[PDB]
Amino acid sequence: PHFCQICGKTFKAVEQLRVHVRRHKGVRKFECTECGYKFTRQAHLRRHMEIHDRVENYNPRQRKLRNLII
């Protein structure tokens, strides 16, 4: 049947797999108003804001996402 990729589980339907491997990736849902960087956690955005507190024109590169676990 439908096989996944990130971890490898035998699934039934194609719609039961999207809701599964969709939560496998953290969604970027928190945007910095200063530099437009979108974060996966609110804590990451707060911690980020503590940088603009002491750096002019800070605009960091968008890093690769890291796979979650389930």
Add this chain to the structure above:
Amino acid sequence: PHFCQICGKTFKAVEQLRVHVRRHKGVRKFECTECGYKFTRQAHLRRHMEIHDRVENYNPRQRKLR
């Protein structure tokens, strides 16, 4: 009472020993099976292996840290 591990100092409360373990500079716990260099981070070992593939006979010396 409970003693330490890395250095091995005598410690009373456990929280003190924890926050002491937090600050220890260079803990080399990532060893290269190819040449023996003990790296302080895994990423440094990943960076080392690439050198171990660029050339053959490579056995560097354990540096003094900062």
Add this chain to the structure above:
DNA sequence: CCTAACCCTAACCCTAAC
């Protein structure tokens, strides 16, 4: 807290030169 990864920099090595 952890780690990953960029990145600058000190520590290293080899050797020419003094």
Add this chain to the structure above:
DNA sequence: GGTTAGGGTTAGGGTTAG
């Protein structure tokens, strides 16, 4: 021939995001 300094190389660690 001891000893030092220069240029290429590599590991240490600061920093910051996932």
